[PDB]
Amino acid sequence: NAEATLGSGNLRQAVMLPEGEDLNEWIAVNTVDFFNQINMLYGTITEFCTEASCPVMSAGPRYEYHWADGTNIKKPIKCSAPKYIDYLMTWVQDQLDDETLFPSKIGVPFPKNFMSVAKTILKRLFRVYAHIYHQHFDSVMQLQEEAHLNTSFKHFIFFVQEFNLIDRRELAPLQELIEKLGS
Amino acid sequence: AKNTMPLVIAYNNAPEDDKIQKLFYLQKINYLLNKTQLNDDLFDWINDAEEGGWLNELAKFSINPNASFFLKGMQFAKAITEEIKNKPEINSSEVNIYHLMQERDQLLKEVEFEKCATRYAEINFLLNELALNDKKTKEIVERQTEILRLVAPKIKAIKGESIDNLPVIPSYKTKELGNHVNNFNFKFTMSGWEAPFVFRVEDRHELGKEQELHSYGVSKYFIEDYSVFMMRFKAEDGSTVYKPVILSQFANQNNLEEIAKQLKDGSPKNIAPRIGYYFVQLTDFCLKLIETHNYHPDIKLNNFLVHNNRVLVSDRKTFTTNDNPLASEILTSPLFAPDEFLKCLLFNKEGDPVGYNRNALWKRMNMPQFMAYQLGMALKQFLILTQLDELPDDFRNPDHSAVSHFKTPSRQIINLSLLVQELTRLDPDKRMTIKQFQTLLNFKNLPPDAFYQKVEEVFPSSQLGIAEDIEALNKVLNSDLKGEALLKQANPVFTKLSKYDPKETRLTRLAEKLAIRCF
Ligand SMILES: [Zn+2]
Q1: CATH of the domain spanning A1-183
Q2: What residues contact residue B272 under an 8 Å CB cut-off, 6+ apart?
Q3: How many other C-beta atoms lie within 10 A of the C-beta of residue B343?
Q4: What backbone phi and psi angles, to 5 degrees, belong to A159?
Q5: Closest residue to B308, CB basis, from A2, A8, A43
Q6: What is the DSSP letter of B327?
Q7: Counting beta carbons within 10 angstroms of the beta carbon of residue B206, is it exposed (0 to 12), middle (13 to 18) or buried (19 or more)?
Q8: What three-state secondary structure class fits B253?
Q9: CA B382 – CA B101 distance, rounded (Å)
Q10: CB spacing of B136 vs A145 below 8 angstroms
Q11: DSSP characters for A61-128?
Q12: Is B280 close to A148, i.e. CB distance below 8 A?
C-alpha cells in the first residue's frame, strides 16, 4: 500500500474555523504552517530533483508550470523545477516575513488585499505537491515517507476545500488523489 | 553457546533433491547465529570459505553473508522460489511485506520443517514476487545489492585487520565530546554515488533484538543499513571481544538537538510549524515501537539523527521488550528521566548518580508512561533551545514551563508548552499518553482557550482527581459579578489550591483565568 496515512486527530475538524475567530487570522496561521511542511517535505527529495530530471517545472507531461514574476514585467518564465521551486520558497517566506501582509502583533490589521496574496501563496504551494507526486513518488517510497507526505497533503487540501481557496481547474493534476482521500 | 549443531546434521541428512529443505536449515542457522554470542572458534566457523564451510555453502545459493537483515532475507527468498514447483495464488497489492517477514521469522525461531514446509515456501514466494513486480521493493533490493558489490573489498580489508592491530573503543556516556575515532568509522564516497558512507561499531555482543525489529513497520525510522557482520576487537582487558560492524550512509544534518538550536537564528513564525513536522515523526515512531511490544528508555533530542529532513534512530542497543522493568534493567539519561526512575538512585554532592537504593529492588517502570514523560521533556528542550543558547538550570522544574522562556510567545507556543506539562506530570497514571498527544498536535493552531477545551475533551480533568476543585472554580467565573465583589467569593477557592503538594497545572492555570476577572 502507498495511500497510507498517519494517525492524527480528525483533520476535517482541525481545519474548521473556530468560533469567534477572524477568517483572515485563520488563513494566515495555517498558511504559515503548510508552507513549512511542504518546504520540509521538498527538502527530503531535493537531491533527486535536478536539472537533468526536471528541465521543465511540471506536474507531469500535461501540466507545465511557468513562473509569474512579481517585480519584473515579462511573460511568465519557463524554467527547471529546481530553479522554479527555490524561486518559490524564498518568495513565500518573504511574504510571511512581511509584517505588512502577515501581521504578528495585535494592533496591526490585515491588508485589504490579504486574501488574494494568501490564495496566490496557496496556489503555488499546491504545485510543489503536484510536482513531487507526479515526478518523484519513487524517491518518496525509497525513503518510506508516503504516509507523512499523504497526511500533510490531506491536511493541506482539506483546508483548501474547507474555504475554497484554489480553483478546481488548478487542482486538476491531482483530482483523482483528492477525491480518494476525502471519502 | 554453539547450538547450531543439530541443524547442520539435518541439513547434511536432507536429500540433495530437496533444496527448499536445505535453504530452510540455512536460514534457520543464520537466524540462530544472530542470537548467539561468539567465541573464537565460532568466529572461524562463520568465516570458513573453504569447501565444507558456512561461507562457501551460502555462495552456492548466491546468499551474501554480509548483507543487511532485509537483503539477506530477500536473497533467501530468491533462492527458494527457484526450487518451487507449486505456484501459489499470487496477488501482490494485497500483501504486507512486514507481516510475511514476521511470520517467516517465527517459523525460523521455533518450528520444525515438517510442520511448516508449505507455508514457508509460500511466504518466500510472495516476498520474491514483490522483488520482481513491486517498484518500491525492487529498487530497494537493487540499491543494496549494488552498494554491497562496491564495498566488498573494504569488508575484506576490515575482516583482515591484524589480530594485534584491532581498535580499542573506550566507553563513555557523554555525547558532548564527540564520536570516538577508530580505523573503521571514516566517511568515504564511492563510484558515482553522491552521499558519503560510513561504518560504525555498535557496543553489543549479538544482534537478537535487531533481527526482530527489522520485520516490523517501526523499522522505517532506522538508518538504512547496507552490511552487517561481526568483528574481532580488543578491550582494555586485552581479550578478544566481538562487536557488530554496520555500514550505512552518513546522516547529513546531525541530530534533533542541533536542529532546534539552528532555529534560534531564523524566522520565529517557523518554529511551531517545524516542531510539528519533526514531532509527527517522533510520535509515529513511538507508537509503532510500542506496537511491537518494544520500548525506548533513552528518548532525548540528540539521540535522534536527522538526515534529508528525516528523523531517524541508529542507536537501538537500549531498546527492551520489558514493559515493566526494574530501574536496574534499563539504560537512560538522568537529566530527562521521570521522577519514578530518579527515586531508585543514590546521588553525591552536586547530584550525580553513583548507584541504586533499596527502591530499585522492587519498583518497576511503566514504559509507555515512561516514554510519554521523556517525549514531553524532548519537546520542552526543543522549545527552549530556540530561545536560549544553553538549557536553564530550572529545566527539570515543572512549575517553569517552556513558554516562560519566550519573550513574544505565539498561540502555538502556548499550546505546545501546555502539552509539555500534560506529558510530564509526576503521577505516571495521570500523564497524557502519546496517542492523545498525537491527536492534539493537529489542533495547535487553535486559539489557546479553544485549544484548552480540546485537551479537556481528549483527556477529561475528572480523570486527574481535580473534578471537585474545577467546578468550584467555574462556580465563581460563570457568575457575572466581577471586580472586588468576585474576589471575596473567589477567595475560598484560592485557599484550597495553595495546599496542593505538587501544583496541578490545569488548576493553577485556570485560577489565573479567575484572578484576571477579580482584579
Ligand atoms: Zn523534480
Answers
A1: 1.20.140.30
A2: A33, B410, B412, B413, B416, B444
A3: 12
A4: -65, -40
A5: A43
A6: G
A7: middle
A8: coil
A9: 36
A10: no
A11: TT-B--B--SSS-SSPB---HHHHHHHHHHHHHHHHT-TTTS--SSS-PPPTTHHHHHHHHHHHHHHH
A12: yes
Is A56 in CB contact (< 8 Å) with chain B?
Answer: no
Residue pointed to by grid coordinates 510543489: A128
Question: Is there a contact between B312 and B223 (Cβ–Cβ < 8 Å)?
Answer: yes
Residue list, CB under 5 A from ion ligand 1: A 49, 54, 81, 135
Half-sphere exposure of B485 (CA within 13 A, CB side): 5
List of chain A residues whose C-beta atoms are within 8 Å of the C-beta of residue B147: none
The DSSP code sequence of B473-485 is HHHHHHS---SHH
Q: Which residue of B has its CA nearest to A149?
A: B277
Residues of B with CB under 8 A from a CB of A: 93, 135-136, 139-140, 143, 194-195, 220, 267-270, 272-274, 276-277, 280-281, 284, 287, 308-310, 408, 410-412, 435, 438-443, 445-447, 450
In sign, the C-alpha dihedral spanning B90, B92, B97, B99 is negative
Place of cell 525506548: B296
How far does the CA of residue B284 sit from the closest CA of chain A (Å)? 7
Would the CB atoms of B284 and A7 count as touching at under 8 Å?
yes
Of B140, B309, B446, the CB nearest to A44: B309
Task: Tell me how far the alpha carbon of residue B272 lies from the centroid of ligand 1, in angstroms.
Answer: 28
Which residues lie across from B247 on neighbouring strands? B199, B227
Measured in degrees and rounded to the nearest 5, phi and psi for residue B233 equal -140, 170
Q: Angle at CA B412, nearest 5°, toward B449 and A154? A: 100
Please tell me chain A's helix, strand, coil percentages from 3-state DSSP, rounded to the nearest 5. 55, 0, 45
- Chain B CB within 8 Å of residue A107 CB: no
Partners of residue B201 on adjacent β-strands? B245
Residue B227: enclosing H or E segment and its boundaries?
Answer: strand B225-234
Here the cell at position B387 is 530561545
Residues from chain A that touch B93, judged by Cβ atoms under 8 A, are: 1
Q: Say which amino acid occupies A128.
A: V
Q: How does B20-31 read in b/e, with b if 16+ C-beta sit within 10 Å?
A: bbbbbbbbbbbb
Nearest to B333 by CA among B281, B258, B396, B241: B396
Nearest to B302 by CA among B240, B382, B372, B229: B382
Say if residue A136 is exposed, middle or buried (CB neighbours under 10 Å; 0-12, 13-18, 19+).
Answer: buried
> Would you say B493 and B469 are in contact if contact means Cβ atoms under 8 Å apart?
yes
Asked if B276's CB is within 8 angstroms of A18's CB, the reply is: no
- Take residue A153 and report the three cell numbers written for it: 497533503
CA distance B86 to B228: 33
Stated resolution in angstroms: 2.6
Name which of B194, B195, B267 is nearest A97 (Cβ-Cβ): B267
Closest by Cβ to B438, choosing from A1, A8, A96: A8
Sign of CA dihedral A53, A56, A58, A61: negative
CA distances from B459 to A12, B439, B450, B504 (A): 20, 11, 14, 14
